[PDB]
Structures are given as C-alpha cells and as structure tokens.
Amino acid sequence: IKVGINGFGRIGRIVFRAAQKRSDIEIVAINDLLDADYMAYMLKYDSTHGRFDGTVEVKDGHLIVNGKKIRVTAERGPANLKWDEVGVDVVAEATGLFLTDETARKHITAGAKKVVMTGPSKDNTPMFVKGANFDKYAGQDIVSNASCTTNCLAPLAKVINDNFGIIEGLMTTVHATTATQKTVDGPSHKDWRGGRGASQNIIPSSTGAAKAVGKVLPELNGKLTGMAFRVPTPNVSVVDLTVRLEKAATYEQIKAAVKAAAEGEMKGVLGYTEDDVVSTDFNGEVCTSVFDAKAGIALNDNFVKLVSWYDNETGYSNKVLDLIAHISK
C-alpha cells in the first residue's frame, strides 16, 4: 500500500516513523512547504522520540530514507500534487487545513484512490476509530480517524457500556502541550486561553472528543461530553472518565472486564496495567488507550472514575495506518 503524506507536521512525522516499522504500508511521497534539506532534519532528530532509527539523505531534491526514494513537493494546492506520477493509493491528510469532503477530494482528483484525515472531520465525513466502528466501514473514498482523545475514550467506553451500561458520562483529559499553544503569552484569536504561556500555566480548553464518541458509537450519543486541561508536558495525555453505571458493579469487576478486553477482542488497542505508571512511561505507546487500574477510584457500585492513558502522537499515528490498511482490504 503506497501512501502519500500531506503535511509533515507532528502527526505527519510520526505517521512516517510508524510506517517504517510496518511491512504492508510504504511511504512514497511527502508534501509540505519545506525544502528537502529541512525535511531530512525534522525526521532525523526528534526532541520527544529521539533520533530516527535508520538512514536519511537528500539527493536530486528528494529524500532517501532507508534506501527508498521519496518524492518531495511543496504544492500549496492539493490538486497540483500529481499523485499519479508516484502511484499513491491512500493519502494521509495531515495538514489540518482540508477537513471537508470538498477540500480533501482534491487528492482524488490529483490521482489518489482514498484519503484519510488525521483529524476529526468538520462535515459529514464518517469517522472511524479502531475497536469502535472499524466494521461499519462501507467503502467510502474519504474517511476520518477522529481525534486522538476520541481514539482513547471510545474503546474504553465501549467495553464499559457493553458490560455495565453507561447512563451518563463526563470526561476530562489532562492534555499535554501541542503546537497550537504558545511558549509565551502571545496572540490567539480562536482561543484566548490557548495564547497564554504553555510551560507556565494549566490552561483549560474545550473539546468535543467526548461528544464525538456518539458518532462512532451511536448507542452513547448524547451521553458523553467533556473538557480538557493543557499542562506543561511535551507528550502523553490521560483521560478522566466519570460514568454512572446502569448495572451494579464493583471495581474488581470493572478491572476484570477491561483486562478481558485488553487480552481479548481489543488487544493492541485497549491496554491494561496495574503498575505505578506515570506519563513518560507511555511515550511511544502503540495502544490508543491504556487503562490505569490503581489510578481509578469508585464512590459506589454505580458511580466510578476511570483513568486511561494515551499518546497523542504515537498512538493516534499508528491508528492512522491501521485505518489506511483497513480501507485497503
């Protein structure tokens, strides 16, 4: 499966690094407003995930990563990309600028077969999260992988709902710093709080990742919404799911249910741990949701507080390839 990446940002670079560890997905073309010499630098060195495992050179204005040529372009218009020349099947849309079917279809016009958005769709484009609704894919040409927080809350909420039933849920993600925020109190027209100093503040932020669970899980629609807190960590976030259960269940029964799915139908997606883990213990975690058993707490048999870790970069990126590989079946 030849895959072309549009937008060599944080998600774009981690999708590239995760593809080097897979055999069914091969990156063949990258497009961003950067020269080839700069793209080789942002791949070779990474402050969060260390140096790149492999070789990377620049020749003829193109990258040579692990002895494989990769076409580099800087087309601002998605239709002028000419994916026919390099032969791309699925385009990884990782710019955040084209999150609609009208704007993402320019890759189909440019010579691609399918498009996967690395973000929550802004229109009626269907969103798919692994372990939640990957079976509901009906061969659409443009899909979406929702958000990274949705890829963490949906697999956990599905197991809790299928076992005990969620009447109403209220979540909160202690999120890490992203490239949206500022290092120092700067301007931010869309979000005033987001313009404050990231390394100095606990910045509240609104998110619709919990309300988006109702789209990938129609049985939980209108039963989930939440918020966020941006904290001065470079990577790895954690959600705080607070749900009211329909069936009475103890915490030891909740741990056994999450552990059964972690070792069963949701292996590789929903993780499970009983260790004294912290955030940096999940830097580079492939799982999109790791349930922290000792961190959670319950008030009674029908009101519990669940804790689940997730990497907002590595975990979501690996599930972008999993969505590319699923639509290609």
148 annotated as ligand-binding: yes
Give least dist CB 46 to Ag ion, A: 18
Q: Please state, in angstroms and rounded to a whole number, the distance separating the CA atoms of residues 157 and 37.
A: 44
- Give the contacts of 320 (CB within 8 A, at least 6 positions apart): 11, 15, 92, 94, 116, 118, 145
Q: Integer distance in angstroms from the first to the last C-alpha of the chain?
A: 10
Give strand pairing partners of 70: 63
Instruction: Decide: 119 and 143 in contact? Cβ < 8 Å.
Output: no
Considering only 153-161, 211-219, 238-246, 305-313, which stretch makes contact with Ag ion by CB under 5 A?
305-313
The verdict on 118 binding Ag ion (CB under 5 A) reads: no
Distance of CA 179 to the CA centre of its chain: 15
**207 annotated to bind ligand:** yes
Instruction: Select from 148, 220, 239, 269 the one that contacts Ag ion (CB under 5 A).
Output: 148
Q: Which of 188, 272, 191 is nearest to 227 (CA)?
A: 191
Whole-number Å distance between alpha carbons of 250 and 264: 21
188 annotated as ligand-binding: no
Question: Whose Cβ is closer to Ag ion: residue 133's or residue 312's?
Answer: 312
Is 181 a residue that touches Ag ion (CB under 5 A)? Answer: no
**203 assigned ligand-binding residue:** no
- Pick 18 or 148: Cβ nearer Ag ion: 148
Segment near Ag ion (CB under 5 A); pick from 11-19, 66-74, 142-150, 246-254: 142-150
Residue choice 312, 314, 317, 318 for contact with Ag ion (CB under 5 A): 312
**Residue 51, Cβ density class (10 Å: 0-12 exposed, 13-18 middle, ≥19 buried):** exposed
In whole angstroms, the minimum distance from the beta carbon of 176 to Ag ion comes to 8
Q: What is the nearest approach in angstroms of Ag ion to the Cβ of residue 126?
A: 20
Instruction: Decide: is 149 part of the binding site for Ag ion (CB under 5 A).
Output: yes
Residue 287 appears among annotated catalytic residues: no
Q: Using an 8 Å Cβ cutoff, are 325 and 25 in contact?
A: yes
Residues that bind Ag ion (CB under 5 A): 148-149, 312
Active site residues: 148
Residue ranges for the known binding site for NAD(+) are: 10-11, 32, 76, 118, 312
